[PDB]
Amino acid sequence: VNQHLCGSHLVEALYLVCGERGFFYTPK
Amino acid sequence: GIVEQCCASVCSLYQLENYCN
Ligand SMILES: [Cu+2]
């Protein structure tokens, strides 16, 4: 399903999706 | 970018995979 994710909620989802691999959080 | 689109619009978990290492 599509997601509406702002602020810390986006970082939560990135953590869930990427887990061990890690991720970059890069807003503008 | 995605930080913008997920919040101002919607985004999928599949789009989020683009940001994994
Ligand atoms: Cu909240």
Author numbering:
A (entry chain B): 2 to 29
B (entry chain A): 1 to 21
Task: Quote the original article.
In its natural form the metal is zinc, but insulin is also known to have affinity towards other transition metals, including Mn, Fe, Co, Ni, Cu and Cd, all in the +2 oxidation state. The coordination sphere for each metal site is thus completed by water molecules, some of which are weakly coordinated and easily exchanged.
Primary damage, i.e. photoreduction, was followed directly by XANES as a function of radiation dose, while secondary damage in the form of structural changes around the Cu atoms after exposure to different radiation doses was studied by crystallography using a laboratory diffractometer. Hexameric copper insulin is found to adopt the T6 conformation in all of the crystal structures reported here. At higher doses no significant changes in the coordination of the Cu I site are observed, whereas the Cu II site is seen to change with increasing radiation dose. Compared with the evolution of the electron density in the in-house crystal structures, the structural changes around copper in site II seem to be detectable at radiation doses of around 0.1 MGy and above. At 100 K, disruption of the water structure in Cu site II was detected at doses above 0.1 MGy. Thereby, the radiation damage to the water coordination could be initiated by the photoreduction of Cu2+ to Cu+. In our structures no significant difference in the first water shell around the Cu I site was observed in the four different structures. The water–water distance also increases, from 2.00 to 2.35 Å, which indicates minor changes, in site I. However, these changes were only monitored and were not explained by the final models.
